[PDB]
Coordinates of C-alpha atoms in Angstrom, one line a residue:
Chain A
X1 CA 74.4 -5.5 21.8
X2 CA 77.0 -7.5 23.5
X3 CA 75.2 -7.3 26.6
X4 CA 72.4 -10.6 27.1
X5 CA 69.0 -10.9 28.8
X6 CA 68.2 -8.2 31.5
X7 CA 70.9 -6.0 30.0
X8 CA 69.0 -4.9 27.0
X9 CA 66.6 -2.1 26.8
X10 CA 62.9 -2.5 27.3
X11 CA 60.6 0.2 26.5
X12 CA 57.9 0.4 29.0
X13 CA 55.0 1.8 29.1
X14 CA 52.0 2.4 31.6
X15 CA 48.0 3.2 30.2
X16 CA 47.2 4.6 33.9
X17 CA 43.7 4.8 34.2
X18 CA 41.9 7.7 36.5
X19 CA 37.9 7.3 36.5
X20 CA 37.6 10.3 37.7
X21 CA 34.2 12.6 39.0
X22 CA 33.4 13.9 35.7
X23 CA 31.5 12.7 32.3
X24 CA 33.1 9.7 30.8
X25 CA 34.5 10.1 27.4
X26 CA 37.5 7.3 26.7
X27 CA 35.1 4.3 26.1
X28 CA 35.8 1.0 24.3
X29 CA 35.0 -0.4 21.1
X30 CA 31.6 -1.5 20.6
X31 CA 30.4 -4.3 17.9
X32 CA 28.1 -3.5 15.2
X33 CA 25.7 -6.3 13.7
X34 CA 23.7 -5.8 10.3
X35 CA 20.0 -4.5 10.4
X36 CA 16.9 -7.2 9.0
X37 CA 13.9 -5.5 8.1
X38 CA 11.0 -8.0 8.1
X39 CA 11.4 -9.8 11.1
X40 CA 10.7 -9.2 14.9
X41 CA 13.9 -9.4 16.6
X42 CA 15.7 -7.4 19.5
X43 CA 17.5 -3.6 18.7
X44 CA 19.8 -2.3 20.9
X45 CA 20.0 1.2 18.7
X46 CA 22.4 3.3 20.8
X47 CA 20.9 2.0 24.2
X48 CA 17.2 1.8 23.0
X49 CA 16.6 -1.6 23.6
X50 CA 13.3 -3.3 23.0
X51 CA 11.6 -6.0 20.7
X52 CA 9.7 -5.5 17.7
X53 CA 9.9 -5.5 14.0
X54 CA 12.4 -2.6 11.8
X55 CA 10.9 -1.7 8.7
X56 CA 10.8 1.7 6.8
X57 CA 9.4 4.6 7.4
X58 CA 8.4 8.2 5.4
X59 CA 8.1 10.2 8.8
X60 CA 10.5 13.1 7.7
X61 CA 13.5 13.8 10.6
X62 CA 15.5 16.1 11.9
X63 CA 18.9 16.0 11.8
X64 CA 19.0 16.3 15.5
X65 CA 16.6 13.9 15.9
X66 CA 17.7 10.5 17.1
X67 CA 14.7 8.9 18.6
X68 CA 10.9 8.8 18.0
X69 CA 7.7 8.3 20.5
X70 CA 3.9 7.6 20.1
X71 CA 0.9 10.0 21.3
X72 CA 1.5 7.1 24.2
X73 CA 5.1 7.8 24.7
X74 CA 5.7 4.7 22.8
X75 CA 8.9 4.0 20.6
X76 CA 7.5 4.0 17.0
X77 CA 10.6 5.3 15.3
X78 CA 14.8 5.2 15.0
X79 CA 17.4 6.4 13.3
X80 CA 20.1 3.9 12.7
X81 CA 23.7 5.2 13.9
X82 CA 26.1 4.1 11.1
X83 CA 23.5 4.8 7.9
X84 CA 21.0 7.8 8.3
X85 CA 18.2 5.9 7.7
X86 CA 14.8 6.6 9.8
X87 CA 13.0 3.2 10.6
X88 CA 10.0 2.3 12.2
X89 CA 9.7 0.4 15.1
X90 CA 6.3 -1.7 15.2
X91 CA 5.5 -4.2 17.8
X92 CA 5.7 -8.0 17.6
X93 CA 2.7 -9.4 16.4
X94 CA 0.5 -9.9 19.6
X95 CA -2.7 -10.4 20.6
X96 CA -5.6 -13.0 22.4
X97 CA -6.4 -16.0 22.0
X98 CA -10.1 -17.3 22.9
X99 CA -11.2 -20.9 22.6
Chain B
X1 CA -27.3 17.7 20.6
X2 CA -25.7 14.7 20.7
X3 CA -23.9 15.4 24.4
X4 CA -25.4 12.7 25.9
X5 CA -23.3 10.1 23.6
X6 CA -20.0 11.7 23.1
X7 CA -20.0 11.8 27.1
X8 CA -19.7 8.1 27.3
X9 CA -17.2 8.0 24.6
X10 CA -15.0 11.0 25.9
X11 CA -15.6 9.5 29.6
X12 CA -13.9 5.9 27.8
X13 CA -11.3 7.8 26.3
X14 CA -10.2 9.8 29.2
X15 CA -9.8 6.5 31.0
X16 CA -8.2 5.3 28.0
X17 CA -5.3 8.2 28.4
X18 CA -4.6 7.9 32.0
X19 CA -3.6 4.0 32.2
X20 CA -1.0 5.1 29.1
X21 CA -0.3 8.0 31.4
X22 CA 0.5 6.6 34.4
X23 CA 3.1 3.8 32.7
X24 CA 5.6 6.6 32.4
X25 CA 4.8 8.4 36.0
X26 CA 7.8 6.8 38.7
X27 CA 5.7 5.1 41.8
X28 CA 8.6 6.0 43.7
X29 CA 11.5 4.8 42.2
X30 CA 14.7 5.7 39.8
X31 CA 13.1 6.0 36.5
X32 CA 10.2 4.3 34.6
X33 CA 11.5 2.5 31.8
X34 CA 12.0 -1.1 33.6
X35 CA 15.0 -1.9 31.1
X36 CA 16.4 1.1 33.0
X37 CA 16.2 -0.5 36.1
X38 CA 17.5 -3.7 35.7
X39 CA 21.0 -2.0 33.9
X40 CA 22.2 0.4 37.3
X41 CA 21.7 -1.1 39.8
X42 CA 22.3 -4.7 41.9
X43 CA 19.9 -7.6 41.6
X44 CA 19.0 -7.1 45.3
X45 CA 18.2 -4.0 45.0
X46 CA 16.6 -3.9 41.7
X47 CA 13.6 -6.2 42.5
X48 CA 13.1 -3.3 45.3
X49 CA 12.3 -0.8 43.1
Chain C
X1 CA -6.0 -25.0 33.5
X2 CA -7.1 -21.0 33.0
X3 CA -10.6 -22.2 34.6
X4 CA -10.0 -24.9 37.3
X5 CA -12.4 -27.8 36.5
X6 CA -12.7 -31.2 34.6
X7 CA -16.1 -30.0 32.7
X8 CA -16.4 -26.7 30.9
X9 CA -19.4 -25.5 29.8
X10 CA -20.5 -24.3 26.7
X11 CA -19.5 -20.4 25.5
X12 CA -16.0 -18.8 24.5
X13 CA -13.3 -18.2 27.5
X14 CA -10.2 -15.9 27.0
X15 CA -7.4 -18.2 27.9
X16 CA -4.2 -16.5 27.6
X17 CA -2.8 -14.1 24.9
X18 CA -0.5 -15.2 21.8
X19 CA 2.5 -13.2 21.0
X20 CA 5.5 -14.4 18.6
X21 CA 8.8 -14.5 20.3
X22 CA 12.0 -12.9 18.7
X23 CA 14.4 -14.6 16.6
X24 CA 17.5 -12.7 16.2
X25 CA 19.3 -9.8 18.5
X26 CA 20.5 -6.5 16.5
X27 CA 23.4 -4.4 18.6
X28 CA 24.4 -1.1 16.3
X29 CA 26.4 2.0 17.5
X30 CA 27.9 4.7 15.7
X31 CA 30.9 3.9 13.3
X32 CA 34.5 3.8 14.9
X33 CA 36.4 7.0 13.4
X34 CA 37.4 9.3 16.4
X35 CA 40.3 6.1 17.4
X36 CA 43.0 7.2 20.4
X37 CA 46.1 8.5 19.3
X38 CA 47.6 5.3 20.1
X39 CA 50.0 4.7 17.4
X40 CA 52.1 7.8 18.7
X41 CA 52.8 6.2 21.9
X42 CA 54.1 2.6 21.0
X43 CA 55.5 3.4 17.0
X44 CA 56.7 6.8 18.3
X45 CA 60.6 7.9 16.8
X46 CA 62.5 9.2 20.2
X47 CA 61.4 7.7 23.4
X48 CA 62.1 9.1 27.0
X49 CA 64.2 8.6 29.5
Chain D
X1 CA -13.0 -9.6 15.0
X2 CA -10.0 -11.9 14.4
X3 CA -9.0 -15.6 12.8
X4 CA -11.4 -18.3 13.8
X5 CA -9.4 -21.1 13.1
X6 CA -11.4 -24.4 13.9
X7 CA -14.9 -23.6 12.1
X8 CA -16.3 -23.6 9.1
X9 CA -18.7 -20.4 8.0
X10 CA -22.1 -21.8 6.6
X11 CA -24.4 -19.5 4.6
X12 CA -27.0 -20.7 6.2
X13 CA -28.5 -18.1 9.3
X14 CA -30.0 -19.5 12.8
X15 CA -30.1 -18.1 16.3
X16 CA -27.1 -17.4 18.0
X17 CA -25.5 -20.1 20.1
X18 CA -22.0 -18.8 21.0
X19 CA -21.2 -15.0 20.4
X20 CA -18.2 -14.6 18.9
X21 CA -17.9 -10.9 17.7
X22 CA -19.4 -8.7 14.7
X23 CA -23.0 -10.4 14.5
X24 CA -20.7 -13.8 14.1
X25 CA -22.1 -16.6 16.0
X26 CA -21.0 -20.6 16.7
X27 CA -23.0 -24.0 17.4
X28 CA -22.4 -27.7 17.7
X29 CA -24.8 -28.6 14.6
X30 CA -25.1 -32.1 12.1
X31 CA -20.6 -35.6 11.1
X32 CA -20.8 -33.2 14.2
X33 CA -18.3 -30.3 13.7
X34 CA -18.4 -26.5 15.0
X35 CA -20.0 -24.0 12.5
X36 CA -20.1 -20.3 11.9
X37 CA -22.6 -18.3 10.6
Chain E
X1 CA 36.4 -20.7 51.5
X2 CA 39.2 -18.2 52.1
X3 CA 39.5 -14.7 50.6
X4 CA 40.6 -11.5 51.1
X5 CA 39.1 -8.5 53.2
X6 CA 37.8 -6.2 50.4
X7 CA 36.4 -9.3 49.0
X8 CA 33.7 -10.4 52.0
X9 CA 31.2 -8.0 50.9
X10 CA 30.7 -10.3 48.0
X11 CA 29.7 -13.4 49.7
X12 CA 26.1 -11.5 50.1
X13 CA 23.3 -12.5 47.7
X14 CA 23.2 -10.6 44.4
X15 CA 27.0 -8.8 44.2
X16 CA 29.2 -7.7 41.1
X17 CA 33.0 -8.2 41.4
X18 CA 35.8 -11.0 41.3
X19 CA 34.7 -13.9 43.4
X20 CA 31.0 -13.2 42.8
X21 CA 31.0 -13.9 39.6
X22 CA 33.7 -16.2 38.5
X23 CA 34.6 -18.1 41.8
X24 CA 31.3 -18.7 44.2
X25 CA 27.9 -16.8 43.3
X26 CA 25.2 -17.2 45.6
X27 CA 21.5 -17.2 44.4
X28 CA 19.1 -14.2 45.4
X29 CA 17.0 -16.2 47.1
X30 CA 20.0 -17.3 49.4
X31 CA 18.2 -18.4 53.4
X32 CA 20.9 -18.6 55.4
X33 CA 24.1 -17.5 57.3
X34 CA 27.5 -16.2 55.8
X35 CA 30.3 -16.6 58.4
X36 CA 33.5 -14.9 58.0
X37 CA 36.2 -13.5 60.5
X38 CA 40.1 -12.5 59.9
X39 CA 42.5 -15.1 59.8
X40 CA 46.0 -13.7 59.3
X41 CA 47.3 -15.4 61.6
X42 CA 48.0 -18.9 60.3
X43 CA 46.9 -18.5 56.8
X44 CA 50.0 -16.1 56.1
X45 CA 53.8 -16.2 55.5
X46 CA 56.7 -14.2 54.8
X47 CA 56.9 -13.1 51.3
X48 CA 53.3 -14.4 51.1
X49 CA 51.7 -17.3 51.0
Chain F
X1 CA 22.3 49.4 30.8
X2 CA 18.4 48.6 29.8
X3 CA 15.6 47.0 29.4
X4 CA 13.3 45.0 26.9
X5 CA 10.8 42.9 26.8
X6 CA 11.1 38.8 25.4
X7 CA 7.7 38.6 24.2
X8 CA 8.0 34.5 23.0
X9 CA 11.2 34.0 22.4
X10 CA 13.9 31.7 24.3
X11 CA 12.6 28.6 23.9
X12 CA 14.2 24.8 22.1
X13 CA 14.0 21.3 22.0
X14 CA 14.7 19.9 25.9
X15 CA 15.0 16.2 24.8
X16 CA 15.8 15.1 20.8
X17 CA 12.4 12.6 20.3
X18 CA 10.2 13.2 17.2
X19 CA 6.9 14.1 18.0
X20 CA 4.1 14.6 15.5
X21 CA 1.0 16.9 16.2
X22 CA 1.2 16.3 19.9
X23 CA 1.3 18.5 22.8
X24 CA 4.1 17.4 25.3
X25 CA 4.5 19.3 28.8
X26 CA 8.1 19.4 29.9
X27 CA 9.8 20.8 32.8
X28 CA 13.0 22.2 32.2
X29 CA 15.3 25.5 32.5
X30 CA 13.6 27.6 29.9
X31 CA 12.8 31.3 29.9
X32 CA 9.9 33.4 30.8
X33 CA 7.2 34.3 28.6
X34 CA 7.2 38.8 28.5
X35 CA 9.6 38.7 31.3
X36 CA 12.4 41.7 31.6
X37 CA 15.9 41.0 29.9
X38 CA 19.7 43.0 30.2
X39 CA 19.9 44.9 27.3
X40 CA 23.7 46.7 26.1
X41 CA 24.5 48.8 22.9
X42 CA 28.4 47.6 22.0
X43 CA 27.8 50.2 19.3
X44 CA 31.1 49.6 24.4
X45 CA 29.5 47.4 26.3
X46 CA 30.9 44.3 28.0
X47 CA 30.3 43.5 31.5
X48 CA 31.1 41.0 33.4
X49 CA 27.3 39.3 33.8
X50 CA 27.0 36.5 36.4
X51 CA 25.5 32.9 34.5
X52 CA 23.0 32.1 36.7
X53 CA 21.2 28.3 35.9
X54 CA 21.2 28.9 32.0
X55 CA 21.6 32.3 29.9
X56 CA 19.4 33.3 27.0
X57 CA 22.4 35.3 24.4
X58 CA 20.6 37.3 21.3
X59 CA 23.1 39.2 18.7
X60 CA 20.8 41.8 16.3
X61 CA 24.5 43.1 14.0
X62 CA 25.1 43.6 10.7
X63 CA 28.4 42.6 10.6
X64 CA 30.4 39.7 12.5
X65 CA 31.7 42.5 16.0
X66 CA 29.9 40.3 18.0
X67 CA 31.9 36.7 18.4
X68 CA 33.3 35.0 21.6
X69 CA 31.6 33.7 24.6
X70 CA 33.7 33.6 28.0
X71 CA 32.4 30.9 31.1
X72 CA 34.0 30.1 34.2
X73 CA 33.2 30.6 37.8
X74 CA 36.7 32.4 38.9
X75 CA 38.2 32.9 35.6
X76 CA 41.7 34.8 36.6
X77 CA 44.2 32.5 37.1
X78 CA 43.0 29.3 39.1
X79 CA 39.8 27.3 37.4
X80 CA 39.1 26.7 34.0
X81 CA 37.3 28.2 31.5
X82 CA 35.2 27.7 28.0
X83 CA 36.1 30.0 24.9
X84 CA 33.8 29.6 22.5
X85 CA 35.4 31.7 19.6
X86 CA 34.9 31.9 15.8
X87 CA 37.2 34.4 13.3
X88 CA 36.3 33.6 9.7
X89 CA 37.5 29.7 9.7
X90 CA 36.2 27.6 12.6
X91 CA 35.2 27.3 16.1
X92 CA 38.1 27.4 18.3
X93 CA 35.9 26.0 21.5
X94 CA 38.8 24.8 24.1
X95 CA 37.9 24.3 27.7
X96 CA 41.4 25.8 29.4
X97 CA 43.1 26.9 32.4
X98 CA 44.9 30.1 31.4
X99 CA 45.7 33.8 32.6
X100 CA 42.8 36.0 31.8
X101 CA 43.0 40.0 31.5
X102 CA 40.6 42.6 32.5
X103 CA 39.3 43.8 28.9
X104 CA 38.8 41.0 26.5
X105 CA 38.9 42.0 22.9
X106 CA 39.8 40.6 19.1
X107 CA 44.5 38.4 17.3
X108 CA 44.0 36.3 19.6
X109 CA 44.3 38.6 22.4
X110 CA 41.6 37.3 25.3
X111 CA 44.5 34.4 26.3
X112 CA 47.5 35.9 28.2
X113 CA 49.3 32.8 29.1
X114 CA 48.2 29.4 28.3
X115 CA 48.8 26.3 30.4
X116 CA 47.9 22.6 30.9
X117 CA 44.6 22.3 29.1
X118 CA 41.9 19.7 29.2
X119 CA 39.6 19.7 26.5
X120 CA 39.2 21.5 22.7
X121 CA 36.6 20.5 20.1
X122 CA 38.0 22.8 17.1
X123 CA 35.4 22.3 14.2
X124 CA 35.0 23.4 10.6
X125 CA 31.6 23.9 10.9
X126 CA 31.0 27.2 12.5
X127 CA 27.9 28.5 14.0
X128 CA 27.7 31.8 12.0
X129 CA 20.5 40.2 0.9
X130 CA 20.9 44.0 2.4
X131 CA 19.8 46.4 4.8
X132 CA 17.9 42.9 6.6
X133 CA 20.4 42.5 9.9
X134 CA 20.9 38.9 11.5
X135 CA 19.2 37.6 14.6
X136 CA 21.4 35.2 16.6
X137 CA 19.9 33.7 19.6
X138 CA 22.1 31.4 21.9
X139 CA 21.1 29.4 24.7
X140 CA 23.6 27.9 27.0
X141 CA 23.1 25.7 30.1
X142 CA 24.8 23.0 32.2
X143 CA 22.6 20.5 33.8
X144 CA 24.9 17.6 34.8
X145 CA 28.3 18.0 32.9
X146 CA 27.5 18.6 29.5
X147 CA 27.5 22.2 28.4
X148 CA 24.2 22.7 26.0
X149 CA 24.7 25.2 23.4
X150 CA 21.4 25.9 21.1
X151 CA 20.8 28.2 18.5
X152 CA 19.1 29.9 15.5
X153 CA 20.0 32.0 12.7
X154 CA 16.9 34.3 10.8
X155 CA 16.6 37.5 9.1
X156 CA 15.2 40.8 10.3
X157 CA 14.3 44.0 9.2
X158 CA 14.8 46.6 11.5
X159 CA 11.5 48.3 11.9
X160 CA 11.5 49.6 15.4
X161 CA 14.6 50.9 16.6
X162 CA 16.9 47.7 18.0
X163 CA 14.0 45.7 19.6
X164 CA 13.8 42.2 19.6
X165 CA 11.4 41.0 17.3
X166 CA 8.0 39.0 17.8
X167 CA 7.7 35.3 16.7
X168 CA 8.1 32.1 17.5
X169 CA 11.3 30.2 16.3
X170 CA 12.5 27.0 18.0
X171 CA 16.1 26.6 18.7
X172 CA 18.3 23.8 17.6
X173 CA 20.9 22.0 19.4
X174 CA 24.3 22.1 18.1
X175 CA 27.0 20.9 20.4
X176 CA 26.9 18.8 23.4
X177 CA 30.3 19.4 24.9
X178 CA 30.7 17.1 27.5
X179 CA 33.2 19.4 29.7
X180 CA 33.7 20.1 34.0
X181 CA 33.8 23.0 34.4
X182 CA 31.7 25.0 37.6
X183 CA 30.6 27.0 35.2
X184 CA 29.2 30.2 37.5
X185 CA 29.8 33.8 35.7
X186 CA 30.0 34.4 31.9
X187 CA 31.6 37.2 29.9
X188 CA 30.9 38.6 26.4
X189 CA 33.8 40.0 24.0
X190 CA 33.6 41.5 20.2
X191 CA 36.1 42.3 17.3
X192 CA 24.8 48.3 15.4
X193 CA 25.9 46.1 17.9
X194 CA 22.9 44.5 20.5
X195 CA 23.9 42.5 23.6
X196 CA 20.6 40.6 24.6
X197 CA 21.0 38.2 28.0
X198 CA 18.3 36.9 29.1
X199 CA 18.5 34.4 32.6
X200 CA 16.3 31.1 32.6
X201 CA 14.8 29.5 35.6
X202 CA 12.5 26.3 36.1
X203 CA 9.4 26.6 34.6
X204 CA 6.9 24.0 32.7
X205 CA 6.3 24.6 28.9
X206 CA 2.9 23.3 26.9
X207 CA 5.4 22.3 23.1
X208 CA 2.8 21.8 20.1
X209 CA 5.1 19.9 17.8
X210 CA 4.0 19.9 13.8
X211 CA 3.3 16.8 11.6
X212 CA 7.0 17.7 10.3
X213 CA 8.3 17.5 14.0
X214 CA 8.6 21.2 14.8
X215 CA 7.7 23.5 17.9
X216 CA 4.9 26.2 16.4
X217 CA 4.1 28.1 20.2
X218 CA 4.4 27.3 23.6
X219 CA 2.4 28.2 26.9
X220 CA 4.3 29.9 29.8
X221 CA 2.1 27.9 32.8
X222 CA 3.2 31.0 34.5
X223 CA 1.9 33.3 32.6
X224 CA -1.5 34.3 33.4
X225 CA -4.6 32.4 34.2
X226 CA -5.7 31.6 30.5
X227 CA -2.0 30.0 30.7
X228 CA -3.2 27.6 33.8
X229 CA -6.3 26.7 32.2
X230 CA -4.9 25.9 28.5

């Protein structure tokens, strides 16, 4: 302790990173908002992303089931990651206009 | 009996199915889904495929 | 504008399409538990040499 | 075959002028205002 | 502008990196000429400049 | 050695999407429809088989002699490995490069000297009425990096001597290890035993998925003619 600046011990350490040729698995924290129900907005739901409205839905999952597509291989259906709850994705209102 | 009709509305279906077919099939490129696309690769070559 | 003139005539013309724009952005992925063993490398009891 | 906001729908039947969809039709009829029927 | 080597391949239109996207970002749509050519000669010192 | 015949069997969920009463054609490593699968009564039996773009594994015991699944292309004393072991707590899956030996068998005898290891995913869960014996398919494969393991546990009653039985069942997905390992050879170990491996090559599949998002039958493409034209 008698010893000042540059005398004193530092404990060092190094987070060496490799990003090496194989399947990533040290990733970084990612942010979580909350979930609206009635009204068309943008999901990101574990990299589905897409527009469209999140309400409920009674289609029974499976509990390796994550995602859900149409007869036209068409989103209609998600499972949120934090609560197991199956939504149902529905498309913003849309439509044509004729004068 | 009634051949004649559900022709025409088999023969609208059928062309009904294939445009929602052929939105998934890759014209040459790296996948179908264009939100795909535009999240591996470089603007200047993303407007290429 | 959709049918270039200064006099239309009389009938019903599809103009363009409507379709409600989002509001809000939603950005959920799994809950944090599986955290790196951090604390053993920075609170750790012996260091090295 | 939608929301035809602009008209008014009168019980009354005439030939059709404008087809608008589902045996719905429009015309420019007497105060001079677009009607349905 | 004066960079480093590793760095000139950024100078194209559309590029991800350093200097591409925090220091000079040209558009996609970019019509010209990007001119570059190694200059340690003068732009360099002992123990850096 | 033998051989049997996989009537419909050896066939699960490629991709995890919910589909309800629709037919979906996918092309992916599954296994042929009435093809000709490696049969070996452990009742000893334990050779080295070669893993070969996907195995199809298929336990039909009584009793838990069968447990342990060995991977790894030269697994002696230079690459790693993939021990996917289970005795009466957990699953003791740990990608490691270690000394082998020549006959595996169940302590924990396989390992003969462990060293510098890369990857273990120990978990609680494991993946294990009467005379009614056990079927246990497996299905392994290793498309990019991550090393699928599907399965499905049912009940059978041993009518005809040790034969695999006829019906559909679809398998589930459990784990999705993501490992790196050149996976190129495989090796069984144990502790009415019935060694089923069946190999799996490309082939397209017709899936008829339930209204409660479930695979009823399939159609082997491959098969015969009626396959082609359904």
């Amino acid at each position: 302790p008698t010893y000042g600046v540059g005398h004193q011990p530092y404990r060092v350490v190094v987070l060496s990173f490799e990003l090496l040729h194989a399947p990533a698995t040290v990733c970084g924290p990612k942010k979580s908002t909350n979930l609206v129900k009635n009204k068309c907005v943008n999901f990101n739901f574990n990299g589905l992303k897409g527009t469209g409205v999140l309400t409920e839905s009674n289609k029974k999952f499976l509990p390796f089931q994550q995602f859900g597509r149409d007869i036209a291989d068409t989103t209609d259906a998600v499972r949120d990651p934090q609560t197991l709850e199956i939504l149902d994705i529905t498309p913003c209102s849309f439509g044509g206009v004729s004068v | 009996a009634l051949g004649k009709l559900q022709d025409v509305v088999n023969h609208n279906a059928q062309a009904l199915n294939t445009l929602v077919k052929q939105l998934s099939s890759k014209f040459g490129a790296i996948s179908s889904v264009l939100n795909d696309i535009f999240s591996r690769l470089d603007p200047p070559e993303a407007e290429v495929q | 504008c959709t049918l270039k003139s200064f006099t239309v005539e009389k009938g019903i013309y599809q103009t363009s399409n409507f379709r409600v724009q989002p509001t809000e952005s939603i950005v959920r992925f799994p809950n944090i538990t599986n955290l790196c063993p951090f604390d053993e490398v920075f609170n750790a009891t012996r260091f090295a040499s | 075959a939608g929301c035809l906001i602009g008209a008014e729908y009168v019980n009354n039947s005439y030939e059709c002028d404008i087809p608008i969809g589902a045996g719905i039709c429009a015309s420019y009829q007497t105060s001079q205002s677009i009607i349905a029927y | 502008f004066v960079i480093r080597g590793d760095e000139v391949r950024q100078i194209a239109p559309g590029q991800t990196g350093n200097i591409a996207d925090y220091n000079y970002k040209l558009p996609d749509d970019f019509t010209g000429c990007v001119i570059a050519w190694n200059s340690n000669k003068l732009d360099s010192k002992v123990s850096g400049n | 050695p033998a051989y049997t015949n996989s009537f419909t069997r050896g066939v699960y969920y490629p991709d995890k999407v919910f589909r309800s009463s629709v037919l979906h054609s996918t092309q992916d490593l599954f296994l042929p429809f009435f093809s000709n699968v490696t049969w070996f009564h452990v009742i000893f039996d334990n050779p080295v088989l070669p893993f070969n773009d996907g195995v199809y594994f298929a336990s039909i015991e009584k009793s838990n002699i069968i447990r342990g699944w060995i991977f790894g292309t030269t697994l002696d004393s230079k690459t790693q490995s993939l021990l996917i072991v289970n005795n009466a707590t957990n699953v003791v899956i740990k990608v490691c490069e270690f000394q082998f030996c020549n006959d595996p068998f169940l302590e924990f005898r396989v390992y003969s000297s462990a060293n510098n290891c890369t990857f273990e995913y120990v978990s609680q869960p494991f993946l294990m009425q009467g005379n009614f014996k056990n079927l246990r398919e497996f299905v392994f494969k290793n498309i990019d990096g991550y090393f699928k393991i599907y399965s499905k546990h049912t009940p059978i009653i041993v009518r005809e001597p040790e034969d695999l039985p006829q019906g559909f069942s679809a398998l589930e997905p459990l784990v999705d290890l993501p490992i790196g390992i050149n996976i190129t050879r495989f090796q069984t170990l144990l502790a009415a035993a019935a060694y089923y491996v069946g190999y799996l090559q490309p082939r397209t599949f017709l899936l008829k998925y339930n209204e409660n998002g479930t695979i009823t039958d399939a159609v082997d493409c491959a098969l015969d003619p009626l396959s082609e034209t359904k």
